Amino acid sequence: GMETLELQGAKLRYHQVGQGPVLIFIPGANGTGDIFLPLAEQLKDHFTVVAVDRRDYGESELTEPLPDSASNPDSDYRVKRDAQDIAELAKSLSDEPVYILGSSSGSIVAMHVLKDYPEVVKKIAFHEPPINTFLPDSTYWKDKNDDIVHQILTEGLEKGMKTFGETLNIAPIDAKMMSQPADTEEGRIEQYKRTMFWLEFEIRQYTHSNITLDDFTKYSDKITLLNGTDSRGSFPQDVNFYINKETGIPIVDIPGGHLGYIQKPEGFADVLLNMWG
Amino acid sequence: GMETLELQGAKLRYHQVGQGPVLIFIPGANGTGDIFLPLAEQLKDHFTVVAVDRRDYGESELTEPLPDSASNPDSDYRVKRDAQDIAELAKSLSDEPVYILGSSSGSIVAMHVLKDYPEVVKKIAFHEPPINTFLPDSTYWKDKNDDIVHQILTEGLEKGMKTFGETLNIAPIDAKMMSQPADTEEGRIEQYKRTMFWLEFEIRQYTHSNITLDDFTKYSDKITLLNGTDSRGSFPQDVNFYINKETGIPIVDIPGGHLGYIQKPEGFADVLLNMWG
């Protein structure tokens, strides 16, 4: 089983194995203490090894939502919160100061532990830290860092709905508006989760729904098949062409492309109104 | 404000505007009824226009978790659930059958409405549906569909931690293991959310933490700077080089690369044991 320390705002889960003085390992960008278990196995005879799931990852769970300003690139809430987690964890296990090793972003947490709770630090190791703040060329790296983040949020969205549109033969215009990044940071990540949910839970399950031609001839007099006039050649229109030629349901051409209801709202209306109004 | 219909397992939110017979619009892959508002504005004088947030998107909220088998590419739970939402929505607003238009995946929902609740369907329109099941070449498109999904889950993970590793000058080996896709579907999307959380809430906030050289000289006798021997040249090691040359904290070389604690667990141990044991 996995150990639990209940602290302010989170249930902190850790692995613990061995005998002796306490050795705490703080994980980097992966964030889970399991990456240290093959290391713990070697040291188990000489230290009580503690490998923590930092509070936002793995078996740890938040009992309170992250403060809203945590998304601000400048916030320091999470890194101080993680360091207090480690100090509180050391105090729960040992009456003397403990050994601490951090790697990558975990060594940055380790830097904040020494700075703010040195009383728990007997000895400490910083393994390959990527912090840039004190470097004479800090600005160069901080700006490089902000650039790739903003890139990835924007480029990840459009890269998926392109190979897709390209195999479905949709108009480039149409893929653009569909994978148009939102005008905001949270709205970019907002849109980003939807797009993943749509991938895993919608596209495969719906395009292979159990629908047959008998589901079109049954009430075929109630149906209309709509093709946009800007998006000829796309896979969706070939579907309509097949339904039409096997069932006799008419195809009505309607302005705009695959998003014609919002591309040409007035023309879409006029066709709908002529159809049903 | 936005309207609410409470149904089994979800609070279904919709927009409603206009006068006359009911016109329901079912959104496609974006999943939210707001995409139809410029269209509703044109029809508002001739229909009561209803533009639904399908239950997994937007202002709609699940009151029960999706059934676990929803992630199976073959599941039909969500598409039948969405169609029942529409039938229940039509019944709540109109004593006579209503007009229904679906687009893209929403027209696939519309196909399931006609099939299962035709009593609510007065007239119905399928706008450019991407369903392939009944086509003579179904298999060709279904297999194309599964391919891009499995691609995107795998290729999205590694594409971000490459431009990153390349600007931080980390060893290719090291980027590989860090953006190594998990051996499972949920574990690929599992790892995938962590990676996004790490982007937005960790990398910028930690690498620009407020740490100065005085946070290294203060208890510098307790500190050790660790560089892996396989990852020379990377940005993290230049950080250590700077700390070392400004403060006198020694650098201990330790086997493995940026993930040496798991790459060379036995060698990492021996160096740690010689250091502190």
UniProtKB/Swiss-Prot annotation, chains A, B:
<feature type="region of interest" description="Disordered">
    <location>
        <begin position="58"/>
        <end position="77"/>
    </location>
</feature>
<comment type="similarity">
    <text>Belongs to the AB hydrolase superfamily.</text>
</comment>
<feature type="domain" description="AB hydrolase-1">
    <location>
        <begin position="21"/>
        <end position="138"/>
    </location>
</feature>
<dbReference type="InterPro" id="IPR000073">
    <property type="entry name" value="AB_hydrolase_1"/>
</dbReference>
<dbReference type="GO" id="GO:0016787">
    <property type="term" value="F:hydrolase activity"/>
</dbReference>
<dbReference type="GO" id="GO:0016020">
    <property type="term" value="C:membrane"/>
</dbReference>
<dbReference type="Pfam" id="PF00561">
    <property type="entry name" value="Abhydrolase_1"/>
</dbReference>
<protein>
    <recommendedName>
        <fullName>Uncharacterized hydrolase SAUSA300_2518</fullName>
        <ecNumber>3.-.-.-</ecNumber>
    </recommendedName>
</protein>
<keyword id="KW-0378">Hydrolase</keyword>
<dbReference type="InterPro" id="IPR029058">
    <property type="entry name" value="AB_hydrolase_fold"/>
</dbReference>
<dbReference type="InterPro" id="IPR050266">
    <property type="entry name" value="AB_hydrolase_sf"/>
</dbReference>
